[PDB]
Design a protein around this ligand. Sequence first.
Ligand SMILES: C/N=c1\[nH]c(C)c(-c2nc(Nc3ccc(C)c(S(=O)(=O)N4CCOCC4)c3)ncc2C#N)s1
Lengths: 252, 309
Amino acid sequence: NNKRWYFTREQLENSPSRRFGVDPDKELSYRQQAANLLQDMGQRLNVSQLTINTAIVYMHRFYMIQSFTRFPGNSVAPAALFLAAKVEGQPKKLEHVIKVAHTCLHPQESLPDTRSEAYLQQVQDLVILESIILQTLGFELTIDHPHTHVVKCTQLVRASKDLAQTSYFMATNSLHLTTFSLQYTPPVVACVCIHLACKWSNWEIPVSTDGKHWWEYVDATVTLELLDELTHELLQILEKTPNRLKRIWNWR
Amino acid sequence: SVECPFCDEVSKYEKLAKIGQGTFGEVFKARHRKTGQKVALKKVLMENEKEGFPITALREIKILQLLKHENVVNLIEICRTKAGSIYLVFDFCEHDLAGLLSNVLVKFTLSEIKRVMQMLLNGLYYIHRNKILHRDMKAANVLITRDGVLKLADFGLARAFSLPNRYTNRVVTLWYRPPELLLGERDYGPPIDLWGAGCIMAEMWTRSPIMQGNTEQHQLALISQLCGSITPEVWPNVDNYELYEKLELVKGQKRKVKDRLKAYVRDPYALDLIDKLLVLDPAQRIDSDDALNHDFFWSDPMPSDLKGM
Ligand SMILES: C/N=c1\[nH]c(C)c(-c2nc(Nc3ccc(C)c(S(=O)(=O)N4CCOCC4)c3)ncc2C#N)s1
């Protein structure tokens, strides 16, 4: 369906990982870690933030079906990134992905002889995993890219370069840090990020001459009640994340 | 064993017949084991794939998932095997235009030929509107269902396009390949598919591919012997292709499109439309929108439904 990859809060609590004894808290970590690894590998592999985001969504969704107890993020991440790069038209070679993943996970360790049996195995392992990812997602790899939605919103609100830059920051961080993508459509997430960026920069969006709020021009469903609940959730996890907020903090 | 809600094993289908037997490999007709629904199965071939799941298959899948239209073949689902293999599953279509056309028993009225071209051009309008180039137009890729609905098929060479573009030049079967590509173009668009529609339209009367070259040069020669010869007068800026002179095109040739096909076709409107499809300059070549609007589809006998096949 359209609702196939969207989950109620109740459904997120009953995740495959919870079913194997993993705390809700532990699981959010496992996700944040995977998204870190994706971000790190993706930066070294020189891929776009769009490609990394795709890989993060793949990851988020993969773990609504599979458990972290059976497939560790350090195994899935590289496979997800390999796939996302192919899908987004920035293909990276299998050997190269393997190499970069190796340095990330084991900075001190030494790369295996590419002639070895141990190495041939891990090549084969990554290919196997990509295939398990493909089938888990039932081959649905076209992702709606949320950055597009953000740019559009910041135009409607005539945001400064700064406001927009902060909105994009909120956007990228929501994927690494929250399961919003599993619960809310890209356009709604965009509103949330813009809402919070305003709140943070102390910008106020003028009530239309119609007395109608902006987000209404963006998604019918969206309400101020929902936005405050979500921006709050997003802010709290930002506050937990060392140095993240410093990047958008007005230091002057 | 691993959970897998969204990818069913292909054994749900029962193989009936290796219909394709093609160098393209391999299409099976099959039957849903519970409902009897007929489908076509295509295995993703992984013979020379060192880069995991073929980027080529991802592209095709992405495209079939996007394209939903009465005149475009319908991908039902993707199936696994349970080992390991992968299969694209399509709604099955009884006929294919290449087969019908080479069958001496089969006969089209002017009215039905109109209908066929209408559906085909309508499919093209749809895929192009969705930023897709088919890149493999030919009679054999045009299917027709038991109920007379035409479907464009085989998106394995298709690709999205946009907005200076550097697309792959060696696309499209030689006989259906437009001048642009043969002259080395990499910044081409929807007009390449329409050139193909032209060759197919003509084929609805000639019952055989009009221009059967053996090499690119032979192909380019054949095209010149039909459409006149490639001239910066006829095709503004054609000279700036590297191969234009560097490929000794002919010089006396003049347009014989209507004369050489005059025999088979007869109907003035049909000849006029074919002439506007087989235009040399891609930018002067008629598009699906205007083609659909052409008087050919709006004069008697008006287009009719498909029957006796
Ligand atoms: C690119 N080739 C194809 N792949 C699929 C899935 C095709 C298809 N075929 C049918 N029915 C059907 C019936 C008769 C024939 C002859 C054929 S054929 O494609 O194998 N043919 C044409 C080329 O030369 C040999 C014969 C197909 N239905 C649905 C699909 C799809 N998709 S074609």
